[PDB]
Structure formats: C-alpha cells, structure tokens
Amino acid sequence: LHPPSYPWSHRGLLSSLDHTSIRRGFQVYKQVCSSCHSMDYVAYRHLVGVCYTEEEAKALAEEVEVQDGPNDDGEMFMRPGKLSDYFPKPYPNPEAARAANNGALPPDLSYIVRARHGGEDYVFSLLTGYCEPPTGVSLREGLYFNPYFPGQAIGMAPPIYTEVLEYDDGTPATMSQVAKDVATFLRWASEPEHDHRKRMGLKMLLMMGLLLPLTYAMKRHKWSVLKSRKLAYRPP
Amino acid sequence: SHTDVKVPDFSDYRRASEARKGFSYLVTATTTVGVAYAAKNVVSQFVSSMSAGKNMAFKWRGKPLFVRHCTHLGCVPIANAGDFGGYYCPCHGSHYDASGRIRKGPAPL
C-alpha cells in the first residue's frame, strides 16, 4: 500500500516545525511511547527547543531517575538525571525489550521517521491505520492488523485512543491529535536541525538570486568582446 | 586593401564613458562583496565545526580540583612535597606554598 500524501505544516518549504505540537509529541512519547521506545541519541539537551527549552528540559532532566545514575558498581539503575542526562530507556538491555515486546523489538524512535520510507506519513498511518482485517488474518502474538503496517501484523501495540493521555496544553487529546502531535515531535527529534537548515536555505536562495545574474553579467561582459568579433576574409 | 574595407558596424553591440566603466566595476565590487559575505559565513561556521597538610582532587569539570587542609605548562603539582610545605610540580620545579602560591621556580602565577 502506498501511503497517501499529508499536509504537514513544517514540511512547508520556508516554514518550520510547530514546536507547540513538537512539545505535545514529546509528552506523548514520555507518557506512552517511552515504555518500549527511547530517544537514546536524543538528550535532554537535544530535547531543547521552543517545545522545551533547557529549563523545561531540566525539569524533564530531573524528571527521571532511570539509568541516569549508577551505583557503587554502576549496575541496574541507581540515580536520577540532569540536563546532560540522555533520554531514559525502557530497557537496560535489548533482551529486556525483546522480553517485554512479544519477543519482538520496540525500536528506539530517535531516527525512526527518517528510517521509514515516507516516515512521517507511515508513522501517522501505522499508529492510526489498523483498519479492519477482512479475511485470512491470523495474528500470532500481540499483533495488530494494520494494512498500513507492512504485514498487517504490527505488534506495535496501538497505544493511542481518544484521550489516550491528556495534553498539558489542553488541546483535545483525540487519537489523531495525539498522533499528529507526537509525529511532529518525532520529526523534530529525527532532524533537530530542520528549522535551522531551512533558514540557511532561505539565505542561500536570496544570495544566489543576487549573485547568479551578476556573475552572468560579468561573464557576458568579458565574453561580449568575442561575441561581437567580426571576422572578414580578404584574400589579396 | 589597406583602406578598402572600413570597420564593420558594431553598433548592434555598441553601448552608448567612465560612467559605464564605473557601473561595470560597481558590479564587480558587489559580486566581490557577495563572495566575501559568503566567505565570512562559510569560513566561520567552517571553522566552527572544530569548536566544542594534604591536598585532594576530584577532577571537577575535567580538571583536577585541588582541595587542601601548574601555571607553567600545566602538570599536576604533587601535594605534600617541595620546599614550601605546599606543592611541587615535577615538570620544572615550581614550589607552591600551602596557599598554592608560587614561591620558587618558573611557574608564572
């Protein structure tokens, strides 16, 4: 199935990510997705954005005690975290996840959107595309039919429902609102520089629009001489 | 011959004198300015990539945090050694008093 198009705002050429949503999607990840998924490469410092400034990130940074700190022997989980603390992990070992995921693996979702062909869409679709299995459906273990899912046997447990959680902003927590919002966050994290870049690209387009006709005019100055040269053959 | 053929008409290409030259220079000037503008930006960020009677230390902030009861070339002063009962740096012989003040040697501060 080829996921159809979707009108993501940030995707606008010169427009950028809506941090508010991003924030909302980070909440969604913290309250739902972090039980099997973790933004390993993302740190509270990485988490910083209009969605969450370092200050807010600090709150979240202090909001966790899992594997943030080690003990006399650095085993298990022994102390809470701070700004530099990287995102907590639902599992201290791959086996742990495997164990708590039907034996399957709940992938950390740091670069998940980048990873999936048409990720942003896929994500939205998968989280909200279980649809209906009309026939020949034998979900073996903790699977969930989803035509959007490659095998319609996602096993990514559908973790979002109307008012699955409660957005602190108060925006109605409808499955879709929730899905779209977290999507933004996930996208934001996958490319912490999406906004940064697009500003460069705008400056690059303005500079090239200034510089291309001027360099063309120089070239046509120094090449006019020849382009006007008139040759004449005058055999004696 | 020498005079049979007069210079052909280039008016088609001919432009209507220093003013013309100035304009053309102005163009080169602006373009050079554009190149330079980009240069400061590119080079800066380009370079930017490479950018980021006893003593006890806890390596606070990646540096030895001496706590007690080298200004010269950066070695570790050795506590409880030296001619000033404070510190001594085996690198070049700087003797620090208990206050950590450089008293003898080549350590600057």
């Binding site: - | 220079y25 080169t28 000037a29 602006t30 050079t32 554009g34 330079a36 503008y37 240069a39 400061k40």
Partner: peptide, 21 residues
C-alpha cells in the same frame, strides 16, 4: 581606483555579512 575598488569591496563584504546574517 583599483586599490580602492578592492578596499570598498572588502568593506562592503564586511557590512553585508552583518546585514545578511
């Protein structure tokens, strides 16, 4: 003047950077 040409240009690039940045 050629030298001033470069000079004003260097200064032009100088300020343009700030403005464009």
């Amino acid at each position: 003047r050629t030298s001033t040409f470069a000079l004003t240009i260097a200064v032009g690039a100088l300020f343009f950077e700030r403005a464009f940045d």
